[PDB]
Amino acid sequence: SGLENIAFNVVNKGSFVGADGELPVAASGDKVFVRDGNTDNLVFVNKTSLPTAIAFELFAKRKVGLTPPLSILKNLGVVATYKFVLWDYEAERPLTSFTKSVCGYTDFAEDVCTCYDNSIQGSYERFTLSTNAVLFSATAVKTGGKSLPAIKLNFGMLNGNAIATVNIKNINWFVYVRKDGKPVDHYDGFYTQGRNLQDFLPRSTMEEDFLNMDIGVFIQKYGLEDFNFEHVVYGDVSKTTLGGLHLLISQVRLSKMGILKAEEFVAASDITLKCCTVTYLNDPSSKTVCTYMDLLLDDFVSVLKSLDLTVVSKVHEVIIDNKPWRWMLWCKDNAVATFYPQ
């Protein structure tokens, strides 16, 4: 019921909930203001390529609180969301430029891979009829008494903050794909965790141990002697060009030791393969193009312990967030020399 009503919701409920009320609002350049008697309050700054009042609407209509991770949805070719929007809080930007039944300006009429939120009346039915589509759900989906083959997540986001099953608290997402007119049989692979350098929290004993233990002690405990962990995960800050360092957790640990900067090529929370320029001040070291992923450390190790250490170079395909990724492996004398994506 108009921008004045949406402003009322955003100011009083932090998002559009369908509350009654109006505030005077005007977009002006990339800013949204609300007239508060004798003062104009800034309530929104547009970092999208959309018109400001539009970006503001979509932000107000984002799914608030508990949300599914973004990169998987992006990876499944999601083009538009149905009756909600998913906000990338890191890039400041909806998941895509397109919606369905959200906003006239951005609505995308053509049949296309659409993402449905099971918590919303009728989205399941529209999803099942589709040739290509994705469904997510706080719970599983069935027909029979027995269910539907599924992507099962034991972590998620909360108002754009990374959260995990953790005192005993269950964080679950069920994500379903239909493609070329039929359910996808099965879902392989690992899932990126969606954490960031500043707010990183460990989600496994092995991760706890990586951050807390001495190097030799951690390597011994988990039997990693043939994987050049000191290079590949710990990072080698001994030359001016910083070696390896290819997980998020690598940065986390090293920044406990000293001052570490990581400058992301393109700010985003809906991407699997990440990349930054990384600088370590204390023992001056940097790597201009530092690829990395936030893989659960257990999963990464599990990948290492399935590699052939006898070849000199192979390219291995790892399935992460539902997509094959090319990881280069250099070996030497039955130990890993380097292991990196691309």
Binding pattern to its own copies, positions 281-320, x when CB under 8 A?
Answer: xxxx-x-xx-------------------------------
Residues 26-85 that bind its own copies (CB under 8 A): 26-31, 33-35, 38-43, 45, 47-54, 64-66, 79-80
* Nearest CB to its own copies, comparing residues 248 and 303: 248
| Token digits of residue 81 | 């969301």
* Nearest CB to its own copies, comparing residues 18 and 145: 18
Residues 223-252 that bind its own copies (CB under 8 A): 240
Return the CA Rg of the chain.
Answer: 23
Residues 9-28 that bind its own copies (CB under 8 A): 10-15, 22-28
Identity of the amino acid at 192: T
- The count of residues interacting with its own copies (CB under 8 A) is 86
**DSSP annotation string for 271-313:** -SSEEEEEEETTTTEEEEEEEEB-B-HHHHHHHHTTS-SSSSE
Options 261, 314, 316, 323; binder of its own copies; rule CB under 8 A: 261
Q: How far is CA 176 from the centre of its chain?
A: 17
Please tell me which residue in 231, 261, 316, 323 is annotated as part of the active site: 231
Report the C-alpha gap between 74 and 192 in whole angstroms: 13
Q: Is 186 tagged catalytic?
A: no
* Nearest CB to its own copies, comparing residues 19 and 335: 19
The terminus-to-terminus CA distance of the chain in angstroms comes to: 49
Q: Strand 80-82 relative to strand 114-117: parallel, antiparallel, unpaired? A: parallel
Contacts of 209 (CB under 8 A, 6+ apart): 218, 221, 222
Binding pattern to its own copies, positions 106-135, x when CB under 8 A?
Answer: -x--x-------------------------
Binding pattern to its own copies, positions 156-195, x when CB under 8 A?
Answer: --xx-xxxx-xx-x-x------------------------
| Residue 9 CB, nearest approach to its own copies (Å) | 10
Contacts of 251 (CB under 8 A, 6+ apart): 197, 245, 260, 262, 278, 292
* Nearest CB to its own copies, comparing residues 2 and 145: 2
Q: Is 316 tagged catalytic?
A: no
| Residues listed for the chain | 342
Q: Catalytic positions, please? A: 231, 246, 287
